[PDB]
Design an enzyme around this catalytic site. Structure first.
Site, PDB file in Angstrom:
ATOM      1  N   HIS A 162      -3.907   5.522   5.766  1.00  0.00           N
ATOM      2  CA  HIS A 162      -2.529   5.714   6.242  1.00  0.00           C
ATOM      3  C   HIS A 162      -2.338   7.199   5.538  1.00  0.00           C
ATOM      4  O   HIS A 162      -2.980   7.880   4.938  1.00  0.00           O
ATOM      5  CB  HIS A 162      -1.407   4.975   5.607  1.00  0.00           C
ATOM      6  CG  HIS A 162      -1.185   3.457   5.775  1.00  0.00           C
ATOM      7  ND1 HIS A 162      -0.666   2.919   4.904  1.00  0.00           N
ATOM      8  CD2 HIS A 162      -1.452   2.871   6.866  1.00  0.00           C
ATOM      9  CE1 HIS A 162      -0.782   1.750   5.263  1.00  0.00           C
ATOM     10  NE2 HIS A 162      -0.969   1.737   6.723  1.00  0.00           N
ATOM     11  N   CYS A 190       0.705  -1.400   0.111  1.00  0.00           N
ATOM     12  CA  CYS A 190      -0.084  -0.109   0.065  1.00  0.00           C
ATOM     13  C   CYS A 190       1.069   1.289  -0.109  1.00  0.00           C
ATOM     14  O   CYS A 190       0.802   2.222  -0.887  1.00  0.00           O
ATOM     15  CB  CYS A 190      -1.091   0.157   1.231  1.00  0.00           C
ATOM     16  SG  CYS A 190       0.046  -0.472   2.558  1.00  0.00           S
TER      17      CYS A 190
HETATM   18  N1  LIG Z   1      -4.293  -5.349   4.478  1.00  0.00           N
HETATM   19  C1  LIG Z   1      -3.684  -4.325   3.998  1.00  0.00           C
HETATM   20  O1  LIG Z   1      -4.273  -3.120   3.958  1.00  0.00           O
HETATM   21  C2  LIG Z   1      -2.792  -4.591   2.836  1.00  0.00           C
HETATM   22  C3  LIG Z   1      -2.631  -3.519   1.719  1.00  0.00           C
HETATM   23  C4  LIG Z   1      -1.539  -3.833   0.682  1.00  0.00           C
HETATM   24  C5  LIG Z   1      -0.934  -5.113   0.575  1.00  0.00           C
HETATM   25  N2  LIG Z   1      -1.105  -6.284   1.807  1.00  0.00           N
HETATM   26  C6  LIG Z   1      -0.464  -7.484   1.618  1.00  0.00           C
HETATM   27  O2  LIG Z   1      -1.222  -8.432   1.289  1.00  0.00           O
HETATM   28  C7  LIG Z   1      -0.956  -9.604   2.001  1.00  0.00           C
HETATM   29  C8  LIG Z   1      -2.001 -10.317   2.588  1.00  0.00           C
HETATM   30  O3  LIG Z   1      -2.682  -8.979   3.360  1.00  0.00           O
HETATM   31  P1  LIG Z   1      -4.303  -9.166   3.861  1.00  0.00           P
HETATM   32  O4  LIG Z   1      -4.444  -8.079   4.707  1.00  0.00           O
HETATM   33  O5  LIG Z   1      -5.109  -9.613   2.634  1.00  0.00           O
HETATM   34  O6  LIG Z   1      -4.366 -10.804   4.729  1.00  0.00           O
HETATM   35  P2  LIG Z   1      -5.848 -11.108   5.319  1.00  0.00           P
HETATM   36  O7  LIG Z   1      -6.724 -10.295   5.195  1.00  0.00           O
HETATM   37  O8  LIG Z   1      -5.269 -11.584   6.645  1.00  0.00           O
HETATM   38  O9  LIG Z   1      -6.238 -12.510   4.445  1.00  0.00           O
HETATM   39  C9  LIG Z   1      -5.120 -13.597   4.149  1.00  0.00           C
HETATM   40  C10 LIG Z   1      -5.881 -14.563   3.632  1.00  0.00           C
HETATM   41  O10 LIG Z   1      -5.013 -15.657   3.287  1.00  0.00           O
HETATM   42  C11 LIG Z   1      -5.821 -16.821   3.396  1.00  0.00           C
HETATM   43  N3  LIG Z   1      -4.921 -17.903   3.922  1.00  0.00           N
HETATM   44  C12 LIG Z   1      -4.259 -18.045   5.408  1.00  0.00           C
HETATM   45  N4  LIG Z   1      -3.417 -19.055   5.029  1.00  0.00           N
HETATM   46  C13 LIG Z   1      -3.339 -19.309   3.562  1.00  0.00           C
HETATM   47  C14 LIG Z   1      -2.253 -20.165   3.240  1.00  0.00           C
HETATM   48  N5  LIG Z   1      -1.280 -21.279   3.640  1.00  0.00           N
HETATM   49  N6  LIG Z   1      -2.483 -20.449   1.815  1.00  0.00           N
HETATM   50  C15 LIG Z   1      -3.488 -19.595   0.889  1.00  0.00           C
HETATM   51  N7  LIG Z   1      -4.199 -18.654   1.751  1.00  0.00           N
HETATM   52  C16 LIG Z   1      -4.284 -18.620   3.090  1.00  0.00           C
HETATM   53  C17 LIG Z   1      -6.847 -16.453   4.813  1.00  0.00           C
HETATM   54  O11 LIG Z   1      -7.702 -17.486   4.544  1.00  0.00           O
HETATM   55  P3  LIG Z   1      -8.575 -17.501   6.139  1.00  0.00           P
HETATM   56  O12 LIG Z   1      -9.252 -16.375   6.342  1.00  0.00           O
HETATM   57  O13 LIG Z   1      -9.705 -18.550   5.723  1.00  0.00           O
HETATM   58  O14 LIG Z   1      -7.730 -18.051   7.045  1.00  0.00           O
HETATM   59  C18 LIG Z   1      -7.157 -15.322   4.559  1.00  0.00           C
HETATM   60  O15 LIG Z   1      -8.131 -15.221   3.496  1.00  0.00           O
HETATM   61  C19 LIG Z   1       0.173  -9.060   2.675  1.00  0.00           C
HETATM   62  O16 LIG Z   1       1.429  -9.602   1.880  1.00  0.00           O
HETATM   63  C20 LIG Z   1       0.005  -7.842   3.061  1.00  0.00           C
HETATM   64  O17 LIG Z   1       1.358  -7.358   3.196  1.00  0.00           O
HETATM   65  C21 LIG Z   1      -1.994  -5.681   2.614  1.00  0.00           C
END
Ligand SMILES: NC(=O)c1ccc[n+]([C@@H]2O[C@H](COP(=O)([O-])OP(=O)(O)OC[C@H]3O[C@@H](n4cnc5c(N)ncnc54)[C@H](OP(=O)(O)O)[C@@H]3O)[C@@H](O)[C@H]2O)c1
Ligand SMILES: NC(=O)c1ccc[n+]([C@@H]2O[C@H](COP(=O)([O-])OP(=O)(O)OC[C@H]3O[C@@H](n4cnc5c(N)ncnc54)[C@H](OP(=O)(O)O)[C@@H]3O)[C@@H](O)[C@H]2O)c1
Lengths: 342, 342
Positions: free
Chosen positions: B225, B143
């Site tokens: 942010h 982000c």
């Molecule tokens: N959050 C933000 O504002 C943001 C912004 C830009 C980039 N990112 C990046 O995006 C990435 C993910 O962030 P997020 O916020 O999307 O995380 P998230 O909301 O916590 O979601 C992670 C997803 O991955 C699934 N998961 C868990 N273990 C897994 C596995 N072994 N294999 C495949 N899927 C699995 C989870 O499923 P379950 O829910 O069923 O456990 C959940 O659906 C990170 O690298 C982060 O740095 C985040």
């Protein structure tokens, strides 16, 4: 001792009252309130003489009816003071200066919410004690300006400052304040960049004109402000020199993230556990691991306990204006020892 | 259409799934979850095929007992994908790449929490689209990095960047997250300065090496942010030039405090009232009144909706990696049109 009147027994006022009482060469002859509340009661229980801040006989009766003993109004004590420390809300300090302090020909200190232009000069004990010596009307600058003045003094002691770039991440509300937000936002304050915070530092240090650049936001926290600094200097200093200069400078202390200081919550916890009155950390606090030098530019992050950082400045400012102590560092050390701080 | 698998239907994953669906040249063949929760249910209701992210029969039965229809596991769908968008937690993306994507010889995109060294290249549609063209394993950067990439592109369009100095004021928890603090603190993150945020931009724009200096903190907000920029340039630019360049650059918009935009809360209120899906503001948002130029140095403040800013970047990255469009700006315009954004 110097006879000090505290006009506005609020976040600043109540602290200056206690800080004056701790000195061996000054005493509080009265404190003032406008509302008959638990803080007015606490003043009386602490042994202060309580006066009504506004000369209004109906308001005096309100205190008497609330069962809080009052000694009269501001007008009944103003003539006995060597100096007034004004602790009134922003804009009201200037009102009191023009309506009360000046007509009664009594010296007065205004706090950081008033303007540089409202007073004769602007106070920080490291920079402008001599300039404020024997003056009648002086502004003790804000929490942020006070913190910046100290770290800039530290840096200046070892190198000449070329450009100081600072971002201020400010608390939304003091802990007691249950009305002011934001609950969940980051608020540009001001939206304009560079902001007025830089020029405020210049009111204390005229030689920093055009060399200080600030931007500020407010966030949903109450505890402390944080500042981030990137400062170009003329000179070849090391991280060790900067660390030593910070350690040498009165009213700056360092903490280590390595020791568990992960955030401003941990700094305040330390204040609480140390046994500080109201948990106050009057010292500016710099994170040791944040300190860095790359190619003539110094980096660091620091935290300011906004409720208390300017309190010892008020004490030294009294000594300057009343010509009690010729030596700024002697006053600083006297104040520090009396308050139990560094 | 390109056959896109979403491995990890989380904050990013659920949004990339909808953004892929909005395109006329790509389709979602499946989304994955590990837990049978209300978000798994929602995926099914939206018409996505749901697979269990971990190939574990005991886990499939958990979904069956919850009465959520699942089509199998990741192994039942992985061989059908033209490309996998990984949306897994930090560190898990790299695990998936080495353990799943590579062994099955399928192209994959990792999100910004993964490492620059984990992948072949680092994506932003303005800067590295061509460089990522036909690559197999790419990181769509964070982000924060995406936001900095966009504003630095706007500035680079009109002047050469000498030094970009940035302070990042980061949200503590996304809105859905009711477990992560701080409730009441400002937290250096990291405590070291300059921080890792600057070199992350350099992973996208190698020519910015040693020209980007960052510091970051986390505060008690969820919404957006904020970034503060002070950027030294070579060349004579005006305020109006910057403003125009920002307006010209896709996926940056401006708001005026004069119009009531007092904080990130008002920006989100606008996304809500606009009718944006999930209130997402995928555009970088710059405050107009913040834009200033002083002695060859550009100042501004901007806000980043961390949940959605990288979403259109994932769509363009798919196109570059699958060699679907040679012209970055054509993909950008197409992606934006389909999503209804600027
Ligand atoms: N959050 C933000 O504002 C943001 C912004 C830009 C980039 N990112 C990046 O995006 C990435 C993910 O962030 P997020 O916020 O999307 O995380 P998230 O909301 O916590 O979601 C992670 C997803 O991955 C699934 N998961 C868990 N273990 C897994 C596995 N072994 N294999 C495949 N899927 C699995 C989870 O499923 P379950 O829910 O069923 O456990 C959940 O659906 C990170 O690298 C982060 O740095 C985040
Ligand atoms: N808070 C900080 O972090 C901080 C730090 C540095 C500098 N300052 C500055 O200090 C000044 C005071 O701020 P504060 O936070 O101490 O405010 P505060 O907590 O609201 O206290 C103001 C006090 O003044 C009293 N008062 C109200 N009207 C008055 C009047 N007409 N004359 C005399 N006293 C009056 C109030 O009495 P009642 O309560 O009975 O109404 C209250 O005791 C401002 O310039 C501010 O910018 C504040």
């Amino acid at each position: 001792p110097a006879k000090v009147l505290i006009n506005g027994y609020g976040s600043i006022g109540k602290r200056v009252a206690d800080a004056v009482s701790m000195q061996d060469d000054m005493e509080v002859i009265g404190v003032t309130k406008t509302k008959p509340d638990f803080e007015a009661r606490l003043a009386v229980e602490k042994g202060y003489k309580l006066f009504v801040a506004i000369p209004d006989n109906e308001r005096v009766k309100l205190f008497e009816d609330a069962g809080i003993p009052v000694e009269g109004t501001i007008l009944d004590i103003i003539e006995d003071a060597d100096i007034v420390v004004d602790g009134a809300p922003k804009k009201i300090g200037k009102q009191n200066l023009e309506n009360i302090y000046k007509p009664h020909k009594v010296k007065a200190i205004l706090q950081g919410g008033e303007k540089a232009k409202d007073v004769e000069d602007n106070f920080n004990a490291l920079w402008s004690y001599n300039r404020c010596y024997g003056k009648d009307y002086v502004r003790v600058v804000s929490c942020n300006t006070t913190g910046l003045c100290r770290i800039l003094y530290a840096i200046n002691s070892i190198a000449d400052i070329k450009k100081a770039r600072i971002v201020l991440v400010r608390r939304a509300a003091d802990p007691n304040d249950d009305k002011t937000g934001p609950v969940n936002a980051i608020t540009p304050n001001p939206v304009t960049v560079p902001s007025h915070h830089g020029p405020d530092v210049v009111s204390v240090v005229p030689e920093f004109e055009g060399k200080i650049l600030t931007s500020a936001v407010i966030v949903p926290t109450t505890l402390m402000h944080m500042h981030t600094l990137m400062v170009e200097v003329d000179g070849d200093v090391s991280r060790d020199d900067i660390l030593e200069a910070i350690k040498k400078t009165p009213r700056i202390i360092t903490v280590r993230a390595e020791d568990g200081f992960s955030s401003t919550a941990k700094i305040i916890e330390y204040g609480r556990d140390l046994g500080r009155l109201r948990y106050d950390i009057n010292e500016l606090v710099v994170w040791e691991e944040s300190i860095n030098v790359l190619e003539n530019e110094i980096f660091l992050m620091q935290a300011v306990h906004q409720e208390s950082i300017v309190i010892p400045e008020n004490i030294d400012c009294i000594r300057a204006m009343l010509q009690m102590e010729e030596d700024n560092f002697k006053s600083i050390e006297k104040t520090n020892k009396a308050m139990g701080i560094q």
